[PDB]
Amino acid sequence: CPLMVKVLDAVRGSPAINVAVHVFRKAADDTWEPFASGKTSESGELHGLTTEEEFVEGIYKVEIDTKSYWKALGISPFHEHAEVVFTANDSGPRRYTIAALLSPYSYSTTAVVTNP
Amino acid sequence: CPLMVKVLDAVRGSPAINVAVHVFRKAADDTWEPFASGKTSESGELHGLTTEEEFVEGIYKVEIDTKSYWKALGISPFHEHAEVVFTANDSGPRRYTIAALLSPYSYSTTAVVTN
Amino acid sequence: CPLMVKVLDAVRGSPAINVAVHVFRKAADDTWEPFASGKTSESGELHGLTTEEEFVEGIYKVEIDTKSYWKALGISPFHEHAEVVFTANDSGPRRYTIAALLSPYSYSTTAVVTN
Amino acid sequence: CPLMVKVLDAVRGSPAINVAVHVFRKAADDTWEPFASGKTSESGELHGLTTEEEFVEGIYKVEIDTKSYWKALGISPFHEHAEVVFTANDSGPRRYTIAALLSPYSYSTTAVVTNP
Ligand SMILES: O=C(O)C1(c2ccc(-c3ccc(Cl)c(Cl)c3)c(F)c2)CC1
Numbered sequence: 096c097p098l099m100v101k102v103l104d105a106v107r108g109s110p111a112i113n114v115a116v117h118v119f120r121k122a123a124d125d126t127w128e129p130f131a132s133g134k135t136s137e138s139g140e141l142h143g144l145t146t147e148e149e150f151v152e153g154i155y156k157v158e159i160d161t162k163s164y165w166k167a168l169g170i171s172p173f174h175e176h177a178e179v180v181f182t183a184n185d186s187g188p189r190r191y192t193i194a195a196l197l198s199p200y201s202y203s204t205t206a207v208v209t210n211p
Numbered sequence: 212c213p214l215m216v217k218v219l220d221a222v223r224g225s226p227a228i229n230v231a232v233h234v235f236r237k238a239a240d241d242t243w244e245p246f247a248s249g250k251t252s253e254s255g256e257l258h259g260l261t262t263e264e265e266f267v268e269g270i271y272k273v274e275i276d277t278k279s280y281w282k283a284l285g286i287s288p289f290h291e292h293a294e295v296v297f298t299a300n301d302s303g304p305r306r307y308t309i310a311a312l313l314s315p316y317s318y319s320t321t322a323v324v325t326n
Numbered sequence: 327c328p329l330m331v332k333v334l335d336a337v338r339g340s341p342a343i344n345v346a347v348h349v350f351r352k353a354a355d356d357t358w359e360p361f362a363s364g365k366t367s368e369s370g371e372l373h374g375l376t377t378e379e380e381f382v383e384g385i386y387k388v389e390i391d392t393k394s395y396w397k398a399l400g401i402s403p404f405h406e407h408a409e410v411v412f413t414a415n416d417s418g419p420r421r422y423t424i425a426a427l428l429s430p431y432s433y434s435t436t437a438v439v440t441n
Numbered sequence: 442c443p444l445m446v447k448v449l450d451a452v453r454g455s456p457a458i459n460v461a462v463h464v465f466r467k468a469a470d471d472t473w474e475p476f477a478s479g480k481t482s483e484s485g486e487l488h489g490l491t492t493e494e495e496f497v498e499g500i501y502k503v504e505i506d507t508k509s510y511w512k513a514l515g516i517s518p519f520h521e522h523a524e525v526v527f528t529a530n531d532s533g534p535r536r537y538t539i540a541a542l543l544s545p546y547s548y549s550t551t552a553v554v555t556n557p
């Protein structure tokens with residue numbers, strides 16, 4: 096699992112469950128090509144997005160669908176989504192965890208990058 | 212001044228000075244069209260991006276060029292840029308401040324929407 | 327104005343208005359002695375806490391009464407208060423802004439220390 | 442494990458290893474009585490602070506020793522520590538995770554509170 100996403104809710108004090116996440120990878124022509132997608136579990140974690148083979152060097156965008164998540168809970172939030180855009184694997188394969196904490200009008204994200 | 216951007220630096224404990232910020236509006240074909248841009252001041256603020264008449268309802272993206280900011284300070288950064296994407300809705304209050312706190316592997320952003 | 331406090335609300339997307347803030351200085355016996363206090367303004371800011379002559383080097387605690395703030399809004403909060411504890415050191419720049427972003431189960435704080 | 446602490450470093454993109462944490466509990470007389478302490482592991486996590494029996498109702502302060510952590514890495518940070526003060530177990534036993542993300546001049550903390 097070289098790409099994981101963990102999301103917490105700062106209003107409820109809970110994992111953020113059933114949050115949709117789409118990952119895109121910048122293509123040869125400079126567009127955002129769909130790469131992987133999935134949704135957070137009961138623990139707020141999203142595993143199994145990709146594999147070591149498929150997760151090659153590139154510029155990736157991890158879009159966390161915070162508006163969808165908040166609307167589902169009956170709340171009108173500010174942002175459309177939270178975006179995390181970064182170059183990956185440019186020194187060889189790393190494992191990345193993108194952690195996010197969500198409020199209706201704010202989010203924070205950080206990355207944990209490990210070398211297996 | 213319906214739209215202001217204010218950026219802080221969590222490593223130096225200072226405003227984030229001379230950071231490029233580009234704002235885009237989402238066009239009818241779902242592409243992002245340039246809307247306004249500038250560099251943050253000594254106080255980490257960017258005023259004067261737009262006028263009331265120009266800032267209509269719509270989806271906007273504020274891209275903050277964090278990677279060049281950290282490289283100019285000799286610090287190795289994780290992100291290509293930071294992006295804040297939101298709907299401007301006239302039912303809400305009328306003045307939008309997008310605020311961001313930058314670290315090399317992290318950022319936080321919040322909106323302050325007032326009258 | 328060597329010391330300013332600015333507080334934002336991540337749930338409402340607004341300044342955090344009428345929040346009580348107490349500042350303490352650490353005494354020689356390691357107890358916290360009252361130093362300054364006030365309530366944030368409509369803009370979420372608290373100016374005028376102290377003067378240059380009064381604000382000496384030392385360890386300070388800024389306690390932000392978040393629990394009463396969230397209860398007055400009818401929201402159930404996690405924390406008793408938020409606390410920011412730091413050393414004021416004259417070798418650094420001279421003006422300290424403590425900024426905080428509040429949520430019911432979370433808060434972030436950063437320092438902006440400038441000349 | 443009803444009380445856990447997880448700490449990330451926003452400068453390195455890593456767990457924050459070997460971070461000291463002291464927990465205090467407000468006593469009958471209104472002082473802060475030492476309750477438990479420990480340090481984060483290689484994963485940035487601190488387990489085994491307390492037990493279900495000992496972690497009773499009360500007002501707790503979790504002090505994360507961020508100044509010590511940064512000084513050990515050769516960095517002069519702003520804060521003495523990060524403090525998380527909250528009432529616990531006042532509706533019966535819950536499990537709490539206090540998550541923190543640290544920068545030299547900033548920190549963020551959130552709580553995840555679960556009902557076993
Ligand atoms: O296993 C992890 O990585 C978990 C975690 C999830 C989120 C956070 C965290 C805590 C604070 C902030 Cl501001 C952000 Cl962006 C992320 C954290 F510190 C830890 C505990 C869920």
Ligand SMILES: O=C(O)C1(c2ccc(-c3ccc(Cl)c(Cl)c3)c(F)c2)CC1
Pocket residue numbers: 203217218219308310311312319320321332333334425426427434435436
């Ligand atoms: O005028 C404002 O709004 C300023 C400001 C700029 C940024 C922040 C801020 C502080 C903490 C976090 Cl996590 C975030 Cl996203 C933003 C803040 F609280 C305040 C103080 C300069």
